[PDB]
C-alpha cells in the first residue's frame, strides 16, 4: 500500500517535492492543491489538480499533506489551517516566529489529532540539529551559523535600464569566519556575519555607474545586509554563478567543532527532506501520535523506508 | 536529582568522559570501574576507583553506565554483561559485528528492562546519521565515507630498529575523493579510499629501505589499507605533522547531484567522549519513561540529548 501524498503550492518547492516523490516508490502523489485557480496551472504529473479551498473535502484520500508555500505569508495562515484537517510537513523558516508558529500549529494538530512536522529543511532542519549537537558536545561555548547560497532578488532589478540579467547570493564574510575559527569567540551581528553579492550582466552600451545607482534606490536595498554589485559577463555568470552550502561552528572556552553541508548541481535538499519527513509523519500518525513536532522530536530511522534492522546492517 | 553516572574502563576514552561530565551539572560521576589495580589508576577528579568485578553491587547507586572499553575485546563481553544491571552507553565501532552486538545487548536489556544505547560517536554515530540522511534525500545513488585522523598506534613501529620517532595518520586518497566529487560514482574498495601515512624520523645509521619495508609489511591493525612511509626531520614532524584536525565527510552521489556532510574536530574536542555523555542523558530519560531494550542513534530524537526544555530548544536553536 503506497503512502498517499498531497501537495500544497506549485512554486519551485512544490515542483521539487513532486520530483522527489518519483524517487520514492513507496509513495503516490494523489493531488496538487493550488493557491491559483487549478484550471490555470499545468502540473507535470498526471494527478488531480485542486484549489486550496477544495482540500477540506479530501481528508480520506490523503495520508500526508506537504505544505510547499513560502514562510513570510503563506505558512502562517496555511500551517495552522491544514493541521486542522491533515498530517502535515512544512519548511517554515522564520526563526523569530517559530515558537508562535509551532504553538498555533500544535493547537490545531492536537485538537484534530494529526501529526504536523514544522520547519524541516537545511536551516531550519539540519542546521538546527547541528546547533543542538554542538551544544551538547561543548556545553560551554558559542555557536555561529554561516550560509553561502543563491537568494531571491529584490522583477525589480530586471526592469532597470541596462540590466540584462541579475542573480544574488548571500556569502559569509571571511573576516568574521576567521575570527570564529580562531577561537576568539567574537560578538557578531547579523550584518557582520554575511554580505549580499548582486551579480549583474549589463546590456551592451549600459553605464555601470547608473545601473548601480538605480539598483541601490530599490526599496529596502539596505535593510539587513551590506551588498556589493558586481558586473560580469553572461558566460561568467553561468560558469561561476554555484554550490549552496554552509557550516555551523561551536567554539568552546580553544575547542572548535564545525559541521558542514555542501550541495552541488541543484539537489533540491529541502524538497526531498519534506518527502522523507512526510514518511516519518505517516508512521507516527499510524501510531496514534498527534500534535506539532520539529526535527528535534523525530528519530532518523523513521525517515527511511528500510527496516530498523536493515538500517543497522547497511548504515550504522 | 542528578543523573548518576558510572564509567567502565579508564583508557583515553574513559578519561575523556570523566572530563566531559564536569561540563554537565545535571550529572554526577559516581565511580570509575577498572580491570587494573585501582590504586595505580590516576583519575583526575576525586572519584572512587573500583574493580570492575564489583560493579554489579552498585546497581542501585548508578543510573547510567558509560562503557569506554575497546570494541574488539572489551565491549563484546561488557555490553551485554552490563545491560543486565544498568542503562548503558557505548561506542562499539566494529561495523560488521553491529547486528550481532545489537542482538546480544538487546536481549540482555529487554530482560533487565534497561535502555542500552550502542555505537555512539563520530563514526559510528554522527556519520551513520549522515549516511541515512543522504539515502533518504537522494534515494538513488551511492554513499562514500572518508575520514582523516591520527592513530592510537596499537607502537610496534616505534620498536623497529632505526626508527627514532614516528606519527601515523589515516588520510583520504585524494584521487578517490576526486572521482566521487566528479560524479563518476566509482566502485571503490576500502583499500582505494584511505591510506595510512607514516612519518618517520630516522635513527643515526639507519637503513631506510629496511625500516620502510618492515613498516609496510609489519602485521598491523590497519591491514585493510596500504601504508605510505615518509622520512622527515624531527623539526618537521613537530611543525607540519602534529595535532592535525580529525574530521571527515560523508558524500551521497545520486542523479548529477552531490550532497556532502562534513565534520571537523580541532584542538582535541574529544567528540566521542562528549557524545557518550549526552546520549547518557537520553538513555536515562527513555528509562524514566519506561522504555527498555537496545537503541542506536537511529532511534534517539535529538531533543533528548539536551538538558534544555523542548520549548527552549525551539526558541533558541531551531
Ligand atoms: N566514533 C566512534 O563511534 C568511536 C568509537 N570508538 C571505539 O571506542 C573504543 C575505545 O577507545 P579508547 O578508549 O581510545 O581505547 P583504549 O585502548 O584507550 O581503552 C580501551 C580499554 O583499555 C583499558 N585501558 C587503556 N588504556 C588505559 C589506561 N591508561 N589506564 C587504564 N586502563 C586503560 C581500559 O580498561 P581498564 O580501565 O579496565 O584497564 C579501557 O576500557 C575503540 O575500540 C573504538 O573502536 C572510539 C572513538 C570513537
Ligand atoms: N573511523 C572514524 C571514526 C574514528 C573514531 C576513532 O576511533 C577516533 O577518533 O580515534
PDB file of C-alpha atoms and ligand atoms in Angstrom, chain B residues 93 95 122-124 127 147 149-150 152 170 246 265 272, ligand 2:
ATOM      1  CA  UNK B  93      32.666   0.563  16.331  1.00  0.00           C
ATOM      2  CA  UNK B  95      30.521  -2.185  11.827  1.00  0.00           C
ATOM      3  CA  UNK B 122      31.610  10.234  15.313  1.00  0.00           C
ATOM      4  CA  UNK B 123      31.523   7.012  13.241  1.00  0.00           C
ATOM      5  CA  UNK B 124      29.532   5.032  14.077  1.00  0.00           C
ATOM      6  CA  UNK B 127      28.422   9.721  10.213  1.00  0.00           C
ATOM      7  CA  UNK B 147      37.902  10.157   7.487  1.00  0.00           C
ATOM      8  CA  UNK B 149      42.558  11.240  11.790  1.00  0.00           C
ATOM      9  CA  UNK B 150      45.688  10.356  13.791  1.00  0.00           C
ATOM     10  CA  UNK B 152      46.237   5.083  18.612  1.00  0.00           C
ATOM     11  CA  UNK B 170      44.642   7.841   8.186  1.00  0.00           C
ATOM     12  CA  UNK B 246      40.461  14.930  12.889  1.00  0.00           C
ATOM     13  CA  UNK B 265      37.385  18.428  15.007  1.00  0.00           C
ATOM     14  CA  UNK B 272      33.056  10.769  21.193  1.00  0.00           C
TER      15      UNK B 272
HETATM   16  N1  LIG C   2      36.873   5.949  11.673  1.00  0.00           N
HETATM   17  C1  LIG C   2      36.402   7.317  12.007  1.00  0.00           C
HETATM   18  C2  LIG C   2      35.883   7.368  13.386  1.00  0.00           C
HETATM   19  C3  LIG C   2      37.102   7.268  14.194  1.00  0.00           C
HETATM   20  C4  LIG C   2      36.713   7.359  15.614  1.00  0.00           C
HETATM   21  C5  LIG C   2      38.010   6.947  16.398  1.00  0.00           C
HETATM   22  O1  LIG C   2      38.365   5.769  16.521  1.00  0.00           O
HETATM   23  C6  LIG C   2      38.918   8.082  16.841  1.00  0.00           C
HETATM   24  O2  LIG C   2      38.535   9.267  16.636  1.00  0.00           O
HETATM   25  O3  LIG C   2      40.003   7.820  17.450  1.00  0.00           O
END
